Design a binder for this molecule. Structure first.
Ligand SMILES: Nc1ccnc2c1N=C(C(=O)Nc1cccnc1)C2
Length: 504
């Protein structure tokens, strides 16, 4: 199932759904629209419904009486495979067996709701390609829908748009004959696999949804104005796409690696993890760190967690191996009395060994939002391996939520960018917070977006959710909250405007 999340259901509607359409073991997840970052896992157990709270303030999903997760899709996958592990306050096991699917099409990229045939034709003509499609409400026939699909070659009649009426009869959907579907999703998925064929032979291939999120960067202020009503719905549509990203994380799951993870279920994807070479021959598994390469698709990044006492040496092995010259830390060492990252650097003017690596803290420079530490890193016994590593430690990020103004973050990122650009052949920029997905993902996505604008100027295309999805395919849960999502838009808006004012 990819439809266990119900975006627009109340608690009462969720109970009644589970009691009338589910059985024991049935479950769904849903947001709170009144509360930032609050979610509920509603589960049927012994003919009654229990509601389990999941909180996210920006670092991870924290399931009450369970574990911490990078995404709700990863949470659901974990518990569907690990019975006995989800427990009530009194210790009673809550079983997740039967996802209860949602018919609401608003989480789907192809759903445009209120939209005329003329508007759909103009959007498909201007932005669409062969096989671009969308579903919209009927204006002629209230309660029905229309599927609109561009087919063609790459305006000379070589391409066209076809509209296919979708009747809704007794809460089922059909295209005039054949199967009646329980939701628009089931209908679209069926006709994605078994495309409709016209009388004269055109195959109405449903290849990709119409893109609605790519904007010109100089239009950012008007997109932000529209989304400030709109952000909630755009974020939901992005979040649905996390169900495509359940990539393997087998290395992080090995016994030998379990205690190298800050959180046991927040793990790097095997396909993009940083593999550590040249390890201690006496250490059976020496290749593992909870870190992934993030390559935008000109810098690359390593996204990683805050060090644990037993991973400081591995952190420095990573930095040295990848030739990283800039570290971005976006947590204090301690927040709300809890350790978010061990101090992995020496005191100012001090020299420390961290296994085979030696680090000197040459000088610290305090700015209003950050401290810069000029570090010198070398392998013990090999003096000519010394290189400067500049650690940019952002210190004023709030304990929960996001900054109210993106100015401090943008000034910090500009400085980080310029430092990186000044070092010939520097490796990826290391970015870390606590779990290395929320703040870390936010800083990385802002940096990627501003980088496009920095090179191409104010008149270039950007697509915030497409960029986030691309980063999320390389490390689980990059960008955690709707507040961080809005902050990314705000930061990009503020960056654009500061370029425009320089020209005045
Ligand atoms: N539709 C989904 C399928 C899978 N996983 C999630 C989904 N939606 C999520 C989510 O966090 N939604 C959300 C919306 C608006 C604001 N904040 C969160 C998470």
């Amino acid at each position: 199932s990819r439809r266990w999340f119900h975006p627009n259901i109340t608690g009462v509607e969720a109970e009644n759904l589970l009691l009338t359409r589910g059985v024991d073991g049935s479950f769904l997840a849903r947001p709170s629209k009144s509360n930032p970052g609050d979610f509920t896992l509603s589960v049927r157990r012994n003919g009654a419904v229990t509601h389990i709270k999941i909180q996210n303030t920006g670092d991870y999903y924290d399931l009450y009486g369970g574990e911490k997760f990078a995404t709700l899709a990863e949470l659901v996958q974990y518990y569907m495979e690990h019975h006995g592990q989800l427990k009530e306050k009194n210790g009673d096991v809550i079983e997740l067996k039967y996802p209860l699917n949602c018919a609401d099409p608003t989480s789907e990229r192809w759903f445009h709701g209120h939209l005329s045939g003329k508007e759909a034709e103009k959007l498909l003509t201007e932005k669409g390609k062969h096989g671009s499609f969308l579903v919209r409400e009927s204006q002629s026939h209230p309660g029905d829908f229309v599927l609109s699909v561009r087919t063609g070659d790459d305006n000379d009649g070589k391409s066209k748009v076809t509209h296919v009426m979708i009747r809704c009869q007794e809460l089922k959907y059909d295209v005039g004959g054949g199967e009646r579907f329980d939701s628009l999703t089931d209908l679209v998925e069926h006709y994605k696999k078994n495309p409709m064929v016209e009388t004269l032979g055109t195959v109405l291939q449903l290849k990709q949804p119409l893109n609605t999120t790519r904007i010109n960067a100089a239009e950012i202020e008007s997109r932000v104005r529209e989304l400030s009503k709109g952000f909630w719905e755009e974020f939901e549509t992005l979040q649905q796409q996390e169900c495509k990203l359940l990539y393997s994380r087998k290395e992080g799951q090995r016994q030998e690696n379990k205690n190298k993870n800050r959180y046991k279920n927040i793990l790097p994807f095997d396909h993009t993890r940083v593999v550590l070479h040249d390890g201690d021959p006496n250490e059976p598994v020496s290749d593992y760190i909870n870190a992934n390469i993030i390559m935008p698709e000109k810098k690359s990044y390593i996204a990683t967690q805050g060090c644990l006492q037993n991973t400081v040496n591995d952190f420095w092995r990573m930095v040295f191996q990848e030739n990283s010259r800039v570290i971005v830390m976006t947590t204090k060492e301690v927040e709300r009395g809890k350790s978010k990252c061990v101090k992995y650097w020496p005191d100012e003017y001090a020299l420390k060994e961290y296994g085979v690596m030696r680090v000197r803290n040459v000088k610290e420079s305090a700015a209003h939002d950050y401290t810069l530490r000029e570090l010198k890193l070398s392998k013990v016994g090999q003096g000519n391996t010394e290189r400067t590593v500049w650690q940019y430690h952002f210190r004023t990020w709030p304990d929960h939520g996001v900054p109210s103004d993106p100015g401090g973050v943008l000034d910090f990122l500009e400085e980080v960018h310029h430092k990186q650009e000044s070092i010939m052949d520097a490796g990826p920029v290391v970015v870390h917070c606590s779990a290395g997905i929320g703040r870390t993902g936010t800083f990385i996505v802002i940096d990627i977006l501003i980088d496009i604008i920095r090179e191409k100027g104010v008149d270039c295309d950007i697509d915030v959710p497409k960029t986030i999805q691309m980063v999320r395919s390389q490390r689980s849960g990059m960008v955690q909250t709707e507040a961080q999502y809005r902050f990314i838009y705000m930061a990009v808006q503020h960056y654009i405007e500061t370029l425009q004012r320089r020209l005045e």
